[PDB]
Amino acid sequence: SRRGILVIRHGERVDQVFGKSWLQQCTTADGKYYRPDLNFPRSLPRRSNGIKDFENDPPLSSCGIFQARLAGEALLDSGVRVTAVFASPALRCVQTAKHILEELKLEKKLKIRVEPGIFEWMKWEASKATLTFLTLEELKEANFNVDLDYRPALPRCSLMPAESYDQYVERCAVSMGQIINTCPQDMGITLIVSHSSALDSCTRPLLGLPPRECGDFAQLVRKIPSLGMCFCEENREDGKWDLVNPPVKTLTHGANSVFNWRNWIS
Amino acid sequence: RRGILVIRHGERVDQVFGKSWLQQCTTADGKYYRPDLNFPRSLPRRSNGIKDFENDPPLSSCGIFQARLAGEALLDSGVRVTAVFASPALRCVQTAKHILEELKLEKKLKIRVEPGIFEWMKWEASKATLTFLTLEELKEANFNVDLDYRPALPRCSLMPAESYDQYVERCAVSMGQIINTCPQDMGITLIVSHSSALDSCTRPLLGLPPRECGDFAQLVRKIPSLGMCFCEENREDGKWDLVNPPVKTLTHGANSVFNWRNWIS
Numbered sequence: 001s002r003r004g005i006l007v008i009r010h011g012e013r014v015d016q017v018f019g020k021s022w023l024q025q026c027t028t029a030d031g032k033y034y035r036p037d038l039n040f041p042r043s044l045p046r047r048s049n050g051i052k053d054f055e056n057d058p059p060l061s062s063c064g065i066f067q068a069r070l071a072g073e074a075l076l077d078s079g080v081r082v083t084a085v086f087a088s089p090a091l092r093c094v095q096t097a098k099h100i101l102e103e104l105k106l107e108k109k110l111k112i113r114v115e116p117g118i119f120e121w122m123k124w125e126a127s128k129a130t131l132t133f134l135t136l137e138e139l140k141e142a143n144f145n146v147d148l149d150y151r152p153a154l155p156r157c158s159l160m161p162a163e164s165y166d167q168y169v170e171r172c173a174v175s176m177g178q179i180i181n182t183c184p185q186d187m188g189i190t191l192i193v194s195h196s197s198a199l200d201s202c203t204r205p206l207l208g209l210p211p212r213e214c215g216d217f218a219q220l221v222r223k224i225p226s227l228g229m230c231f232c233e234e235n236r237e238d239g240k241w242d243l244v245n246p247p248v249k250t251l252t253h254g255a256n257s258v259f260n261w262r263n264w265i266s
Numbered sequence: 267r268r269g270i271l272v273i274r275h276g277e278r279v280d281q282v283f284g285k286s287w288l289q290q291c292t293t294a295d296g297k298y299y300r301p302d303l304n305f306p307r308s309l310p311r312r313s314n315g316i317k318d319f320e321n322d323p324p325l326s327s328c329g330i331f332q333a334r335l336a337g338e339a340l341l342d343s344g345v346r347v348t349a350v351f352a353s354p355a356l357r358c359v360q361t362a363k364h365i366l367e368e369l370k371l372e373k374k375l376k377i378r379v380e381p382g383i384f385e386w387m388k389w390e391a392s393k394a395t396l397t398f399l400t401l402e403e404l405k406e407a408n409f410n411v412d413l414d415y416r417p418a419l420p421r422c423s424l425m426p427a428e429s430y431d432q433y434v435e436r437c438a439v440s441m442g443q444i445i446n447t448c449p450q451d452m453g454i455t456l457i458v459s460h461s462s463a464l465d466s467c468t469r470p471l472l473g474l475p476p477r478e479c480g481d482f483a484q485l486v487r488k489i490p491s492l493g494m495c496f497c498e499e500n501r502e503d504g505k506w507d508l509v510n511p512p513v514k515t516l517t518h519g520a521n522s523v524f525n526w527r528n529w530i531s
């Protein structure tokens with residue numbers, strides 16, 4: 001058998017669909033959560049500072065949960081052995097990981113290791129996002145089987161708001177370094193649930209390739225669909241990684257437009 | 267207050283993968299595979315073989331998700347669902363089933379197949395080459411259909427090619443029956459059908475004449491999957507009011523075709 005690394009982009013986020021005002025849309029006059037569209041999720045997990053810190057840490061939409069579940073179900077069907085799961089500290093990523101594991105039927109067996117070293121390039125994230133993350137206890141209370149004992153390659157408070165592209169790609173290389181060295185003897189698939197950028201930044205170091213030019217890289221991160229996947233396998237006898245077809249198919253689906261019949265006909 | 271909720275079927279495999287979708291998921295000798303996750307995990311068995319899916323396609327995976335999300339929202343709304351009628355098109359019976367599953371009512375309420383609320387057979391892409399699953403086939407494939415329900419229109423009667431004026435009369439005829447089938451006991455009746463039905467199954471209830479064909483078509487083409495139209499009955503005043511549906515709308519984005527080879531290297 002061949003050891004594998006499957007890098008997975010998170011499912012659809014609520015703010016991709018509902019835009020910058022999404023949080024004000026689902027907050028009642030009295031400050032409570034409600035669903036003004038069915039693509040808002042059933043609930044939000046409990047957090048520090050109430051509903052207000054979801055600002056730069058949006059959850060999956062109902063469609064994004066579906067995508068994540070559909071991919072976990074396909075993984076179950078495929079027969080592949082999944083041995084570890086690492087997630088970006090971003091809520092959307094931990095949730096995608098949770099839903100994949102639930103459909104693998106492994107949510108109890110495998111703990112999600114939260115790795116800030118595979119968080120988004122800080123350039124593209126709010127400066128105060130480092131301070132936005134759900135803590136591991138908050139996640140645990142919200143029913144996320146998070147590895148409380150995992151020691152990240154890059155702790156969340158070491159993320160630098162002004163990290164350059166060069167610094168970004170380096171800390172992804174180092175994180176993947178540690179991830180690969182957890183137990184180099186395991187022979188199943190490790191999941192890396194992260195951002196569009198990770199499908200490049202987390203695989204190129206494994207492939208022994210130089211970082212992509214920043215501009216080419218920026219154009220590539222636009223092209224990865226929700227739950228988009230990239231799969232690397234290690235050759236046992238020479239220790240070399242190669243890109244191969246992921247163990248499951250792509251997911252292609254249409255949009256659903258906003259609609260009100262009574263409005264429409266006036 | 268007695269309500270009627272008209273609901274368009276979820277996303278169809280052929281909306282996303284085109285008319286050749288069946289070629290994409292079947293092997294030389296008719297074996298089904300799943301080339302993309304939006305193809306369903308299996309196809310039910312058909313009397314005249316898979317070829318019949320070309321004019322009677324199933325829901326995509328996204329369509330199933332849409333149906334289930336609406337069922338789950340209906341349950342959360344607290345409304346009481348009395349009855350469920352569905353068009354004989356496979357996509358409609360599938361949408362009905364998945365709604366009922368999330369309402370947790372699929373053992374309790376039987377789906378009543380009504381050929382009278384089938385699509386407009388002018389727009390319909392065929393001639394005399396459309397065959398629905400029989401009730402027996404549907405029950406075989408685990409749809410809790412009502413074997414004892416007597417339809418307003420028999421499926422054999424479906425005039426194989428129709429104009430606009432014929433379609434709207436038929437829908438009005440059938441809705442008359444459906445309003446008479448149900449016992450006086452209120453709650454909500456689900457009518458799982460096509461996008462054209464949100465107008466053609468409501469205008470007759472509202473005592474309203476049909477729209478000019480261009481005006482109808484223009485409005486109808488913009489109904490999304492699981493799009494809803496809701497009419498409540500004023501029993502003392504003997505007439506129907508078009509009202510806000512008991513569940514919110516569903517907005518989501520697409521997921522585009524991805525080829526890792528084109529990008530990751």
Ligand SMILES: [Mg+2]
Nearest residue numbers: 081082083109
């Ligand atoms: Mg084991």
Ligand SMILES: [Mg+2]
Nearest residue numbers: 134135136137
């Ligand atoms: Mg913490």
Ligand SMILES: [Mg+2]
Nearest residue numbers: 163164165166
């Ligand atoms: Mg820079």
Ligand SMILES: [Mg+2]
Nearest residue numbers: 258259260263
């Ligand atoms: Mg609107």
Ligand SMILES: [Mg+2]
Nearest residue numbers: 283284285286
């Ligand atoms: Mg086409």
Ligand SMILES: [Mg+2]
Nearest residue numbers: 523524525528
């Ligand atoms: Mg492509």
Ligand code: NA
Nearest residue numbers: 013015016196
């Ligand atoms: Na995005």
Ligand code: NA
Nearest residue numbers: 278280281461
């Ligand atoms: Na259509």
Ligand SMILES: [W+6]
Nearest residue numbers: 010194195196
């Ligand atoms: W992203």
Ligand SMILES: [W+6]
Nearest residue numbers: 275385460461
């Ligand atoms: W349709």
